[PDB]
A paper describes a structure:
The SAGA complex is a regulatory hub involved in gene regulation, chromatin modification, DNA damage repair and signaling. Human SAGA is a 20-subunit, 1.4-MDa complex with five functional modules: a scaffolding core that includes TBP-associated factors (TAFs); a TRRAP (Transformation/Transcription domain Associated Protein) containing a phosphoinositide-3-kinase (PI3K)-related pseudoprotein kinase (ΨPIKK); a histone acetyltransferase (HAT); a deubiquitinase (DUB) and a metazoan-specific splicing (SPL) module. SAGA regulates gene expression by interacting with enhancer-bound activators, recruiting the transcriptional machinery and modifying promoter-proximal chromatin and is known to be involved also in DNA damage repair and signaling. Here we present the cryogenic-electron microscopy (cryo-EM) structure of human SAGA (hSAGA) and show how the arrangement of distinct structural elements results in a globally divergent organization from that of yeast, with a different interface tethering the core module to the TRRAP subunit, resulting in a dramatically altered geometry of functional elements and with the integration of a metazoan-specific splicing module.
Single-particle negative stain showed the presence of a central core domain sitting atop the distinct cradle-shaped TRRAP module, with a Y-shaped density flexibly tethered to the core domain proximal to the TRRAP cradle. The lack of a stabilizing TAF6L HEAT–TAF5L NTD interaction probably contributes to increased flexibility of the TAF6L HEAT repeat domain, a critical platform for HAT and SPL module integration. Furthermore, the local repositioning of the TAF5L NTD exposes the TAF6L interface to allow for SPL module incorporation in hSAGA. While our EM structure revealed the site of incorporation of the SPL module, very little is yet known about its function or how its components partition between SAGA and the U2 small nuclear ribonucleoprotein. The SPL module subunits, SF3B3 and SF3B5, are shared with the metazoan spliceosomal SF3b core complex within the U2 small nuclear ribonucleoprotein. Therefore, SF3B3/SF3B5 cannot be simultaneously incorporated into hSAGA and the SF3b SPL complex.
Author numbering:
A (entry chain E): 10 to 133
B (entry chain J): 104 to 233, 248 to 331
C (entry chain B): 1 to 203, 255 to 585
D (entry chain C): 1 to 26, 31 to 254
E (entry chain G): 59 to 161
F (entry chain H): 114 to 181, 188 to 218
G (entry chain F): 5 to 134
H (entry chain D): 59 to 87, 96 to 117, 119 to 264
């Protein structure tokens, strides 16, 4: 019909994640994203192959380029294992000792957003 | 319709399945690394070679060209200096040459831009055609006068908060995700500032010292 | 190469338990009851575990072999405690006697003969006036070898038990300030192993009130009402928070020199504007200062101030004296999703995109505890009514109850088909509800840690929950633009219009677009919020 | 508000006092923790000899002599010697390790907090011995750091309990699932849930903030000496710091 | 010669000085930096079946990832700029689309 | 001829960017958009940023056809924008035709 | 137990690679296709996460760019118009392209178009009994 | 001056077209009635008057900002709020105006819609830098530079706020003067060629 | 194999250096200049390809240096002096200037370039008796330079005129690097508490290699506007110290 | 006229491990600090196993 196949693929992905409705040009955005990713990966593969002094590129060059790209760009938070270690090293410190309060106590002034610039002059 | 609602969701690839396998070698006394966390110093050329060879081994290599050691030493020093520059920029003025080259990191010249005198001095004292001592002394006095800081103040030594803010802002000084992600979390767990009670004891000790001085 | 079976899991669990010696040498089907306890026995357990080890040995003790120091440390301490003219110098005086006795006794077990005599001579003449302590002070005089300490009767109870001392918090900090000032390692070892300081603090059906926002235009994100029902706050996709006065009074700020939602140049003067009485109040205020979409705003227990979290991975406390951000908590490197405050405003926690939650105090600008263990984003968080346990929902379809003070996972429920979005405790501290994209509402039994009840009927994402102050009814809001109240108490009914029959009490789907919040108040009140169009 | 807090604090103080004085009383094999609780119960009944002193102060160090228990020993030699680990054998035998320097203080941090390292367990299981006791592993710390008597014992045998931590549980989950079978995410979560349910401390589910006040008091007193300045001061004079200082003279 | 962090700090700004925690953190970061860079260079060497870790591997990795150029190691490896030409089919479709747009 | 101080000059510089746009952008970061000086300065910075790109694009367009006159319509194509943008680490790669 | 996951064809990857000026083999095309599909799904999940916390169903381009920014990836520019961009088939009937009409700048440069501000927010209370 | 410069560019292009047609036709040889004197693009309604009797190039003249003025004190009224839908249209028009001022006169829709988003990104980043600097100052109570604006200007490549005056001088005022001179010269040439004396 | 180590060791002292310049310093400076020249040549090659000439004409090199006005103005003045000198040795000797003015007239749109162009020494410093060691020394210079560059195995090549520009660019590179090293040394040894000492700076005892390494590290960083809070926008390349 | 599809969720050809290494069974590290201690302990357990025979 009107659409090409790639637009249908992207719409199907959006459906899969559970997106009911959306702005139209989102699909164009996704197409440009995929195109740019592929082109940059190929360009990097060219350099990594020419470094190895060999003819037209192959699987190994592409995989190396993808590894280098992923070591930089497509990121996400560290895993559970590292977080558990830092958590263990953090929880050992003591907590404050509760006492009756006339409302919660704020931290000291030297560490609060209540300091005027010293250059500025004040007026009466 | 509902049952087949969560069957095509995203399944992130676990990052550990591609973890490196560790093989035990002979425990010898000569085979030691000296990670900089242990020895509170930068590693010398010789010390770096021991661990470079050890790492190379697990990848099926023979030895290092001995020009690589120099490059790695230079790069490590360069990278540390880059981070230090990022941290310094956030709490001191500086100048610019050619638009990016930052050299004079004191807080001195910084002509206040809203003074008619500053506007005039900027045009001349900055664009110098590319110095008798009396003239230089006069012009230094002028630059200090225009800066506007009548009663300059200073900061305590560099602490954790400065590093945290610097790293959060710039973030192009650590392009690699692995180095940044693991160390930022560590930095978070070392943030600290004295609480009310400690400040009270500081008050008391100051009273004590003042008294014993009188 | 096939998926394991249900029983095989129990088999592996039993194998683990046997290997680590948790159960007897047989089938412990008798065992598996100790899943709860009362206050006094919890105190007993924690007291037994507190004295079942030493908190610090390896680093707390000195390593240099220089016996001359034991004199210097004690001498400096005595000099400092003497010239002091404070009320603390009083309260921290009693420690000298156990310190001397234990330092001498430890010298004996490893010290050549030269040192001990000089030590006894240099300080002994201050533990005489009291009678109860002259006995042992004199007894020590005739003591050289280890057989002295084991043989004698009075030395023994000292050697094999700890001395008690009572201090205030201020006094203990008085000792710590000195201890950290310089090398005092030997004294730290004595305090760690032998002395036992004790620090304690110094001295007739329901009625619905509904709210609607008109001019929002896909920007309103959340809203809330304070406990005393006098304020209404909301957050927006464009970073900003707006506040309304429910009562007939106006909102007016008071003088304040500093504001972060403002920029001054070098050529400005800080002056408190006097052309101000012209305003004399207004019904609405805009709070500014986040640089990203806001996702939660919570009130304090006593409606004193406001707290909020934003996409810019920051948490800000707003002072309602001046309606200005005055504190800023920075403890995250990724966007913060949720926030929550403890029953009496003692703590507050926060879930984040970084797969973890963190504990905070209102008087320190840095996290205190970290609860790692979830596999993905921590989207929901709620305190327990007693403010000692913590529940957190995650996109991995799991819910974990945590131990606030200690910080380890104590429970882990499973069964949801999709991510979780809300949580709620009943004020009797017995059950925990949770809802998510699956469109099922599960109540869990905390003590047994097993499914207790399942409710169905909503047809779209459930995004809020709440109990009545008597665990009577549980109200839910869904993405279908509906509000349904429920009853779980034995009172049964026969109204099976859908899956759940006898619990579904009332349904309210009037003219209303997306819902925002649901609450309860003193007497059969159920406040609601959301946007509408008609 | 202030009134409610004062009520809760009074309740917590009362509960602490009564639990200290009037403990309540709660098989072929009796747990090590059961024996600890019982030795605690006994010590309450007795009276002390000296005024201003208590008896129930070292439940472990006392419950060591009362029978044989398999422990893990740590040797802390003086000077720049290092440290080493020993493992008593079934045959009145022994084994010991290389002497590791005092700079690589990775293990000492674990010992300093009474937390079971995860590297230890993977091997201790391979060594077919029953040194575990309800997850925890008892360890003995011998140190010749300070002594000039030239005797036979020349060390101060301290005992401590290395409790397991959330790291150990995740390692266990990883270990059990590495069997020939397949495991799906749901199944791993089920296994973890069962393990957590089995070995978790009992819950004091009760709606009153007296509970949290009591818990805060007890924990604070447990760990009131781990402030950041304390640890900085300890680290400032530790042996590795001294070894660094000597180099600076040149 | 011995090297300390303050020695590097002096190069950037003589008058500044850090706390102790910052000193620990910077060394930890340096450890991680080395552990990553050397591994990456070793893999680049592994790519071309080479037996020895040559410097040009480190040069390539530093230039491509960390945008770092260490200056004193020659110019034996500088790629000569190419034409970067396109293929027949591509130009064919571009001409086709130009035609379809013309009328 | 005159050399008035900076704030006197700034009141004469009119920015192409409207004030409401700068207010929109200031409100995102949490600032009250009422000070005219700040609005002016931010708008001027944005204008400079765009102007530099425009200049580079026009020069690149001039150089394109040299080998192989003045009266011609100057139009802007992606092949002129890409090198100009790349000066600022912006990598433009856009598809041409889909399927 | 049987499930499906749409993936792009080998032909699309080869067509993209053509613009670069490289002729790709058979295995490489499928490798790249699977990698690109994984990245698309990751980015889409991340984008949906931001929308989850706003109580709105439509997904904007701002959400996508925000998710890309947090994942340390350059952003996509030129699709924030809130108006449809129809596609065009060529003569044969297999190639498509987007309409890109030339525009005379001076007309837009010399034109006054006053915009309408927004209206202030307000809240009405609405009680009921049941 | 921006609008008038665009106008002058159009007039100059028109004049060159007329000049080339006429010169070529009468080099080869109403073909007897040349066009006609076009028409100046009426100078602005401010720059004109500035082009009163005080002739501000006088000596002993001082001009300074009144410190009581609203502008100097930095006082005004909150700008009009407007949604994203309309903000994008206004920024689109501004980008078109800048492109026209540059020297172009037409372009592709994709190029313009892309430059709009590039500007969007730049504005967001500038304001975020401002946010962070303001918070840091509010905590520590001091700034590296005299004020936060100077800091942010330094951190985005620009040298200092005092570089804006040079930028304006070179890029706007002198550009307008250059265009006027060229327009007058070409108009005089056309006048000399239409009606020889 | 060739080298300029001894030649540069004398060039440097002209630019405010010690009586006896260090050797390995010049060794490293040689490689720095070589690398910058090679990369500049590649960029020029990319420039020419648009015009479709397959020769690196002076217009291509003059195009890369179209941003910094002061350096461009100095380049134009040097071109004037070179055409004038060649005239005195012998288009009517306005060839270089003709080319430069033609190109700048071609590209400019605001009259900003022309400003640098329009605005007694060449006779006051010429009253002696010069009648051909100068020409021979210049020939030695150019001949050695062409060989040292090794500019043959390239799909495109520079012509006769552009080589003069390239040599001038190498000299300017050397001067700029010396200047930056001097600024870095000025910064390091300050330890100044008195504000006058730190302020008069707006205007061993030799330039060790560490100074040059620091200067290059510091210059390599460019402050882009879309950098903050990310790393997805790096100007992947190398700053040209001379251009 | 069907969009090509596979029976399993896609996987990335190469991804980003965080520099982690697996010590034994079911334990991962990120810093190479336990290398010395692990070698020592492995030898200890080796010998302690040898002697029981």
């Amino acid at each position: 019909k009107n659409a090409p196949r790639d637009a249908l693929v992207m719409a199907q992905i959006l459906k899969d994640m559970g997106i009911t409705e959306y702005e139209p040009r989102v699909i164009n955005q996704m197409l440009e994203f995929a195109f740019r990713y592929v082109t940059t990966i190929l360009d990097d593969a060219k350099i990594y192959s020419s470094h190895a002094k060999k003819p037209n590129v192959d699987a190994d060059d592409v995989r190396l380029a993808i590894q280098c790209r992923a070591d930089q760009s497509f990121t996400s938070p560290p895993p559970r294992d590292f977080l558990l270690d830092i958590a263990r090293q953090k929880n050992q410190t003591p907590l404050p000792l509760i006492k009756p309060y006339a409302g919660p106590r704020l931290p000291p002034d030297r560490y609060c957003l209540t300091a005027p610039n010293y250059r500025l002059k004040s007026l009466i | 319709s509902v049952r087949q609602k969560f069957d095509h969701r995203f399944q992130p690839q676990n990052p550990l399945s591609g973890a490196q396998q560790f093989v035990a070698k002979d425990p010898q006394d000569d085979d030691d690394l000296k990670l900089c966390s242990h020895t509170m110093m930068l590693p010398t050329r010789g010390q770096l070679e021991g661990r470079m060879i050890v790492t190379a081994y697990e990848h099926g290599l023979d030895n290092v060209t001995e020009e690589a050691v120099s490059a790695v030493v230079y790069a490590v020093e360069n990278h540390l200096k880059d981070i230090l520059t990022s941290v310094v920029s956030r709490r001191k003025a500086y100048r610019l040459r050619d638009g990016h080259f930052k050299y004079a990191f004191g807080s001195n010249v910084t002509p206040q831009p809203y003074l008619k005198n500053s506007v005039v001095a900027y045009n001349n004292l900055i664009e110098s055609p590319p110095p008798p001592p009396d003239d230089a002394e006069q012009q230094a006095a002028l630059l200090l006068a225009c800066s506007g800081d009548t009663l300059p103040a200073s900061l305590p030594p560099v602490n954790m908060y400065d590093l945290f803010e610097a790293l959060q802002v710039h973030r192009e000084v650590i392009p690699t995700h692995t180095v940044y992600a693991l160390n930022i979390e560590r930095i978070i767990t070392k943030l600290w500032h004295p609480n009310h009670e400690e400040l009270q004891q500081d008050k008391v000790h100051r009273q004590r010292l003042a008294a014993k001085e009188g | 190469m096939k998926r394991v079976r249900t029983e095989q899991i129990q088999m592996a669990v039993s194998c683990y338990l046997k290997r680590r010696q948790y159960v007897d040498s047989d089938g412990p089907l008798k065992q598996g009851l100790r899943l709860s306890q009362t206050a006094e026995e919890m105190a007993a357990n924690l007291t037994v575990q507190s004295e079942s080890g030493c908190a610090n040995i390896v680093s707390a003790a000195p390593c240099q072999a220089e016996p001359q120091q034991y004199e210097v440390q004690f001498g400096r301490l005595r000099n400092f405690l003497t010239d002091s003219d404070s009320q603390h110098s009083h309260e921290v005086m009693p420690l000298l006697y156990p310190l001397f006795v234990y330092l001498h006794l430890n010298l004996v077990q490893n010290s050549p003969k030269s040192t001990v005599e000089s030590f006894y001579s240099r300080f002994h003449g201050m533990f005489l006036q009291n009678a109860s302590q002259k006995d042992v002070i004199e007894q020590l005089q005739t003591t050289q070898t280890i057989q002295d300490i084991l043989s004698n009767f009075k030395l023994r109870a000292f050697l094999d038990n700890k001395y008690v001392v009572r201090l205030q918090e201020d006094s203990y900090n008085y000792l710590i300030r000195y201890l950290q000032s310089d090398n005092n390692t030997a004294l730290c070892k004595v305090l760690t192993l032998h002395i036992h300081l004790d620090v304690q603090p110094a001295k007739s059906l329901t009625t619905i009130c509904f709210y609607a926002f008109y001019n929002t235009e896909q920007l309103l994100n959340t809203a809330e009402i304070s406990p005393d029902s006098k304020l209404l706050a909301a957050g927006f996709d464009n970073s900003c928070i707006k506040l309304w006065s429910l009562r007939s009074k106006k909102l007016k700020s008071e003088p304040h020199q500093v504001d972060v939602s403002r920029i001054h140049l070098a050529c400005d003067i800080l002056e408190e504007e006097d052309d101000e009485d012209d305003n004399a109040g207004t019904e609405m205020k805009i709070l500014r200062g986040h640089c990203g979409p806001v996702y939660s705003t919570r009130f304090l227990a006593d409606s004193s101030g406001l707290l909020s979290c934003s996409e810019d991975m920051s948490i800000r406390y707003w002072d309602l004296g001046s309606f200005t951000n005055t504190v800023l908590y920075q403890g995250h490197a990724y966007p913060v999703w949720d926030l929550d405050i403890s029953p009496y405003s003692l703590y507050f926690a926060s879930g984040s995109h970084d797969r973890t939650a963190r504990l905070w105090s209102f008087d320190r600008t840095y996290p205190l505890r970290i609860y790692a263990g979830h596999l993905a984003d921590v989207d929901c968080v709620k305190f327990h009514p007693n403010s000692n346990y913590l529940a957190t929902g995650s996109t991995d379809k799991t819910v974990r109850l945590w131990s606030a003070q200690q910080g380890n996972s104590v429970r882990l429920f499973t069964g949801h088909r999709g991510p979780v979005l809300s949580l709620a405790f009943s004020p009797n501290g017995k059950y925990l509800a949770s809802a998510g994209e699956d469109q099922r509402l599960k109540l869990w039994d905390l003590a047994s840690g097993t499914l207790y009840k399942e409710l169905r009927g909503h047809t779209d994402n459930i995004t809020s929950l709440t109990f009545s102050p008597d665990s009577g009814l549980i109200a839910s809001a869904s993405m279908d633009n509906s509000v349904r109240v429920w009853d779980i108490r034995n009172t049964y009914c026969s109204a099976p219009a859908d899956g759940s029959s006898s619990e579904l009490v009332g349904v309210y789907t009037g003219q209303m677009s997306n819902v925002l919040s649901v609450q309860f108040m003193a007497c059969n009140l159920l406040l609601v919020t959301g946007i509408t169009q008609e | 508000m202030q009134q409610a807090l004062e009520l809760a604090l009074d309740r917590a103080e009362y509960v602490i006092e009564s639990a200290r004085q009037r403990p309540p009383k709660r098989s072929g094999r009796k747990s090590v923790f059961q024996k600890l609780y019982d030795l605690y119960i006994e010590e309450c009944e007795k009276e002390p000899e000296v005024k201003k002193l208590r008896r129930n102060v070292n439940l472990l160090e006392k419950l060591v002599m009362q029978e044989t228990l398999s422990c893990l020993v740590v040797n802390l030699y003086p000077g720049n010697e290092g440290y080493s680990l020993m493992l008593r054998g079934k045959n009145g035998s022994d084994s010991e390790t290389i002497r590791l320097p005092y700079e690589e203080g990775e293990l000492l941090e674990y010992l300093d907090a009474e937390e079971l390292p995860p590297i230890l367990v993977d091997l201790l299981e391979k060594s077919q011995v029953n040194i575990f006791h309800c997850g925890c592993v008892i360890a003995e710390i011998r140190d010749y750091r300070q002594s000039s008597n030239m005797k036979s014992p020349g060390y101060q045998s301290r005992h401590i309990l290395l409790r397991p931590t959330m790291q150990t549980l995740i390692c266990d989950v990883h270990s059990i699932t590495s069997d020939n079978h397949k495991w799906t995410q749901e199944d791993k979560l089920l296994l973890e849930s069962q393990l957590i349910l089995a070995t978790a401390e009992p819950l004091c589910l009760d709606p009153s903030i007296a509970v949290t006040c009591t818990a805060n008091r007890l924990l604070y007193n447990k760990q009131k000496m781990n402030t950041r300045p304390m640890k900085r001061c300890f680290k400032r004079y530790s042996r590795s710091s001294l070894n660094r200082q000597q180099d600076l003279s040149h | 010669t011995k090297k300390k962090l303050q020695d590097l700090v002096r190069e950037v700004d003589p008058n500044e000085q850090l706390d102790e925690d910052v000193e620990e953190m910077l060394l930890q970061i340096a450890d991680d930096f080395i552990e990553s860079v050397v591994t990456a260079a070793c893999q680049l060497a592994r790519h071309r079946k080479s037996s020895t870790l040559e410097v040009k591997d480190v040069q390539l990795h530093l230039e491509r990832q960390w945008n770092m150029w260490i200056p004193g190691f020659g110019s034996e490896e500088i790629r000569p700029y190419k034409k970067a030409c396109t293929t027949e089919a591509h130009k064919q479709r571009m001409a086709l689309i130009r035609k379809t747009t013309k009328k | 001829t005159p050399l008035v101080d900076f704030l006197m000059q700034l009141e004469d510089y009119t920015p192409t960017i409207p004030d409401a746009v700068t207010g929109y952008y200031l409100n995102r970061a949490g600032f009250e958009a009422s000070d005219p000086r700040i609005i002016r300065l931010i708008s001027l910075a944005a204008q400079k940023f765009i102007s530099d790109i425009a200049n580079d694009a026009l020069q690149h367009c001039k150089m394109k056809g040299t080998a192989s006159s003045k009266d011609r319509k100057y139009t802007l194509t992606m092949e002129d924008l890409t090198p100009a943008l790349s000066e600022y680490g912006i990598n433009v790669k856009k598809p041409h035709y889909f399927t | 137990e049987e499930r499906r996951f749409v993936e792009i064809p080998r032909e699309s990857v080869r067509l993209m690679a053509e613009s670069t000026g490289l002729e790709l083999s058979d295995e490489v095309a499928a490798l790249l296709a699977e990698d690109v599909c994984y990245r698309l799904r990751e980015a889409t999940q991340n984008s949906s996460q931001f929308m989850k916390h706003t109580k709105r169903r439509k997904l904007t381009v701002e959400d996508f760019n925000r998710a890309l920014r947090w994942s340390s990836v350059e952003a996509v520019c030129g699709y924030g118009s809130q108006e449809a961009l129809p596609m065009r088939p060529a003569r044969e009937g297999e190639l498509y392209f987007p309409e890109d009409r030339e525009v005379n700048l001076v007309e837009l440069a010399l034109a006054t178009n006053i915009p309408k501000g927004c209206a202030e927010t307000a809240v009405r209370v609405h009680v009921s009994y049941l | 001056p921006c609008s008038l410069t665009i106008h002058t560019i159009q007039l100059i292009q028109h004049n060159r077209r007329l000049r080339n047609l006429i010169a070529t036709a009468q080099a080869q040889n109403x073909x007897x009635x040349x066009x006609x004197x076009x028409x100046x693009x009426x100078x602005x309604x401010x720059x004109x008057x500035x082009x009163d009797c005080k002739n501000p190039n006088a000596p002993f003249q001082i001009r300074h900002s009144d410190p009581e003025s609203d502008f100097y004190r930095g006082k005004g009224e909150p700008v009009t709020e407007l949604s994203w839908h309309s903000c994008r249209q206004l920024l689109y028009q501004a980008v078109a105006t800048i492109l026209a001022h540059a020297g172009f006169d037409c372009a592709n829709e994709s190029v313009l819609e892309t430059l709009t988003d590039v500007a969007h990104e730049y504005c967001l980043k500038f304001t975020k830098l401002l946010r962070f600097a303001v918070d840091r100052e509010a905590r520590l109570g001091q700034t590296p530079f005299p004020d936060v604006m100077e800091q942010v200007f330094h951190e985005v490549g620009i040298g200092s706020v005092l570089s804006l005056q040079k930028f304006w001088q070179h890029r706007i005022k002198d550009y307008h003067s250059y265009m006027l001179q060229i327009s007058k010269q070409l108009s005089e040439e056309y006048e000399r060629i239409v009606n020889p004396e | 194999s060739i080298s300029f180590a001894t030649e540069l060791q004398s060039m440097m002292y002209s630019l405010g250096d010690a009586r006896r310049p260090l050797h390995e310093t010049a060794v490293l400076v040689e490689d720095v200049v070589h690398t910058q020249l090679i990369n500049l040549l590649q960029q020029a090659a990319e420039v020419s390809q648009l015009r479709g000439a397959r020769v690196i004409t002076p217009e291509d090199l003059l195009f890369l240096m179209r941003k910094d006005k002061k350096k461009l103005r100095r380049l134009l003045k040097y071109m004037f002096i070179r055409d004038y000198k060649s005239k005195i040795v012998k288009n009517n000797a306005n060839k270089r200037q003709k080319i430069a003015q033609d190109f700048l007239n071609s590209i400019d749109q605001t009259g900003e370039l022309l400003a640098m162009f329009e605005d007694x020494x060449x006779x006051x410093x010429x009253x002696x008796x010069x009648x051909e060691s100068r020409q021979l020394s210049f020939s030695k210079k150019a001949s050695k330079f062409r060989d040292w560059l090794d500019c043959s195995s390239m799909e495109i090549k520079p012509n006769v005129v552009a080589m003069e520009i390239l040599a001038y660019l190498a000299y300017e590179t050397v001067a700029q690097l010396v200047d930056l090293a001097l600024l870095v040394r000025q910064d390091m040894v300050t330890k100044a508490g008195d504000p006058f000492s730190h302020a008069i700076s707006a205007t061993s005892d030799a330039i060790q290699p560490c100074h040059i390494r620091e200067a290059i590290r510091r210059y390599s960083h460019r402050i882009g506007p879309l950098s903050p809070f990310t790393n997805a926008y790096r100007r992947n390349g190398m700053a040209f110290l001379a251009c | 006229l069907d969009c090509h599809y596979s029976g399993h969720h896609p996987q990335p050809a190469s991804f980003c491990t965080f520099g982690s290494r697996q010590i034994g069974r079911g334990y991962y590290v990120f810093d190479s600090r336990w290398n010395r201690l692990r070698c020592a302990l492995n030898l200890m357990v080796e010998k302690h196993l040898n002697a029981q025979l």
